[PDB]
């Protein structure tokens, strides 16, 4: 049956033929070779791989029931951390050291800016990611609301020549703020020149410079009359399009048409928490996207790839610019497997292993030659996140699954490094020797925040309620991972050698507040962090302009922010917190975020999707934030702050709302057969069943449920 048989695996027909047919013509790869080295590696780390998950079940079972037997008031920290090391959750801090990681892009090394993360599944998405490394600062302007559209400035079917007004403005600021001229402002001039390799900038009465003449990186068109002119400020670089015959440029004092800003320096293409990939049909529709992507050919009706930018230098000779953001691609972690291979016995293959190989050997098409030049990385590098490890051994063993995997396909050792999230509460208080477990595959660390609230609520579910989502944002626990997280950085030498991450910004409409509050990521010091659409890159560069963050990595350096107790501080609610309306506003909205995501996971197989919260806030929902709200309500539910009638309750009453927000034509209802639903028992389970899930995971449950919808469709 679908299956063909490669020593103990049994590999679905699907999966074998998009491999052979597609992913391995143009490697040099022998088709044999490679399928045997799959049987290899998966039957040589499979028992690694099912220890490791075994180890995390042991030291949770340890701490509920320690937490369970604690008697004494609030909890004895001292007692609390040498029972952490004594378990071995607490492993020793290793003597400094400097990472080794070499032959990577200058993108990861050194530019600091905005990374993006797309679902590798949708192909227009991952196309306009890749497409992202420049964007309109206009267009991300006049798009959203961070020009208001208070006087006149409301958008309409047609261009509002009040607000392109106000768009040209801020920009005009921005680039007074980024590339000061000697004397006057940008918004004065009115024209562009080069002269002797020198910018010139024409006011009203006089002409002016740059007061930093190096931020001039070059131009288009004839040195007296530009087409453009491309500016550099903090390594990112800035082109001001200049074309008097323009329907806005013929309203532009200098003839300025749009501001063009270097934008998504990177992009994760994620088979992750943004996607439903639950069989071997979907893991090939996401392999085959990474493909295109590599190979440089992916298309959708046409939208291609962009080729290089090409510039004169100020001196009159001619280079060229990356055009398309530098790929990642995010592999699953060690948790799941997948029947996309199952063995003799019928037992599935662990996703990870999985995607190290077909996602490994799908990237050497973009270390090659595309029919123009190699589409990814020039050094020679693959660039693979890692997602939800739990401690530096998992660490040891991602790299030792790359290591193998680089031995099947052929390549140099250390050619598929590793961006490490820290995402779970092992890992946080462990990072230093998690780092030194990658120490010459590492390309970044960064702080997934939300998976990290997830871990923190199972890892204590035993110690008492939790604090509201809304509040952990501001918790100690947090706030101290977030500083201990660039400290480990740069402590092991990620200055100039490899990105300081941090997390998404969810709340895709408000981009007025994510321009007023996201600076806040490059002033700690991160080189990176994530936004979740080209426009929200364009405006998180703005960030990049403002805050000079190599300079602010230099003043980090040798602090040691965080101590391991602040760590450690579990985000417990104190008695009598709230009262009953703040307890009920908290379930409805915790049932509606899952009901409102679980219902295109399970029924259409969406993995990221804008769902309306209960203050209609439009939030960008993954699977982390999934984890969150689920473990939430069952801590809630464990100690007693609800009742099992309460949260099915508020199920019933949040379901419709969800069955109204969505009407789309696809969508079918899940009120009022709820027991005829299987996405509303997917959420119900989630919530009942979240205790007993392993570290509060909710792939096993989505999974199952998500294969279960597409049994009874077909049938
Ligand atoms: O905080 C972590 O745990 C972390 O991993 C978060 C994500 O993965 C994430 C969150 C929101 C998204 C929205 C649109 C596309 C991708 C997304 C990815
Ligand atoms: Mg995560
Ligand atoms: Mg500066």
């Given at each position: ?353 999985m995607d190290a190989l077909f996602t490994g050997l799908i990237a050497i098409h973009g270390l090659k030659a595309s029919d123009g030049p190699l589409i990814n990385s020039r050094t020679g590098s693959i660039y693979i996140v890692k997602p939800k490890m739990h401690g ?324």
């Open positions: 049956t679908d299956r063909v048989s490669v020593g103990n695996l049994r590999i679905a027909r699907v999966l074998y033929d998009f491999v052979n047919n597609e992913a391995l013509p143009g490697t040099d790869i022998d088709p044999d070779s490679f399928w045997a080295g799959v049987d290899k590696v998966v039957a040589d780390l499979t028992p690694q791989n099912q220890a490791l998950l075994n180890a995390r079940d042991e030291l949770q079972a340890q701490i509920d029931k320690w937490h369970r037997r604690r008697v004494i008031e609030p909890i004895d920290m001292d007692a609390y951390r040498q029972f952490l090391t004594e378990i071995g959750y607490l492993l020793p801090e290793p003597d400094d050291f400097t990472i080794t990681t070499s032959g990577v892009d200058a993108e990861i090394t050194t530019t600091a800016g905005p990374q993006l993360v797309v679902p590798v599944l949708n192909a227009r998405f991952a196309l306009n990611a890749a497409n992202a490394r420049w964007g309109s600062l206009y267009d991300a302007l006049y798009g959203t609301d961070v020009i208001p559209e208070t006087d006149g400035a409301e958008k309409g079917p047609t261009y509002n020549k009040v607000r392109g007004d106000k768009v040209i403005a801020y920009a005009r600021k921005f680039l007074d703020d980024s590339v000061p001229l000697s004397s006057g402002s940008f918004g004065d001039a009115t024209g562009f020149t080069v002269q002797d390799g020198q910018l010139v900038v024409a006011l009203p009465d006089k002409s002016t410079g740059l007061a930093n003449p190096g931020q001039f990186a070059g131009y288009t068109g004839a040195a007296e009359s530009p087409t453009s002119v491309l500016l550099i400020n903090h390594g990112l670089h800035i082109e001001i399009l200049i074309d008097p015959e323009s329907q806005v440029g013929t309203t532009d004092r200098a003839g300025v048409k749009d501001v063009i800003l270097e934008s998504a320096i990177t992009t994760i293409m994620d088979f992750e928490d943004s996607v439903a990939a639950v069989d071997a049909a979907d893991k090939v529709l996401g392999y085959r996207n990474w493909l295109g992507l590599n190979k440089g050919d992916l298309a959708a009706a046409l939208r291609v790839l962009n080729r290089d930018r090409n510039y004169t230098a100020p001196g009159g000779g001619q280079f060229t610019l990356p055009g398309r953001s530098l790929m990642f691609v995010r592999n699953v972690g060690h948790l799941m497997t997948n029947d996309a291979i199952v063995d003799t016995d019928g037992s599935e293959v662990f996703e990870g292993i530096p051994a998992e660490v040891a063993f991602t790299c030792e699954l790359f290591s193998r995997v680089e031995d099947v396909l052929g390549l140099p050792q250390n050619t598929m490094k590793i961006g490490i999230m820290d995402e779970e509460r092992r890992t946080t208080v462990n990072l230093k020797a998690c780092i030194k477990a990658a120490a010459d595959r590492v390309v970044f660390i960064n702080t997934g925040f939300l998976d990290r609230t997830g871990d923190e609520i199972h890892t204590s579910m035993e110690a008492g309620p939790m604090v509201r989502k809304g509040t952990m944002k501001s918790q100690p626990w947090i706030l101290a991972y977030e500083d201990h997280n660039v400290d480990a950085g740069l402590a092991a030498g990620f200055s100039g050698r490899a990105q300081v991450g941090k997390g998404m910004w969810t709340m895709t409409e408000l981009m007025a507040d994510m321009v007023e509050t996201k600076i806040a990521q490059p002033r700690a010091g991160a080189s990176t962090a994530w936004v979740p659409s080209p426009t929200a890159a364009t405006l998180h560069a703005l960030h990049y302009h403002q805050v000079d963050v190599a300079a602010v990595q230099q003043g980090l350096a040798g602090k040691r922010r965080a101590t391991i107790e602040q760590l450690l501080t579990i985000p417990l609610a104190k008695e009598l917190a709230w009262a009953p309306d703040e307890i009920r506003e908290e379930v409805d909205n915790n049932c509606q975020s899952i009901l409102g995501y679980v219902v295109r996971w399970v029924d259409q197989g969406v993995g990221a999707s804008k769902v309306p919260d209960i203050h209609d806030v439009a939030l960008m929902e993954d699977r982390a934030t999934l984890r969150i709200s689920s473990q939430l309500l069952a801590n809630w539910l464990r100690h007693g702050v609800i009742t099992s009638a309460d949260v099915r309750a508020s199920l019933e009453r949040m379901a419709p709302l969800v069955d109204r927000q969505n009407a789309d034509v696809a969508y079918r209802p899940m009120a009022p057969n709820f027991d005829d639903s299987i996405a509303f028992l997917a959420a119900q389970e989630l919530i009942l069943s979240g205790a007993q899930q392993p570290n509060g995971y909710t792939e096993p449950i989505l999974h199952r449920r998500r294969r279960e919808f597409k049994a009874r469709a077909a049938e």
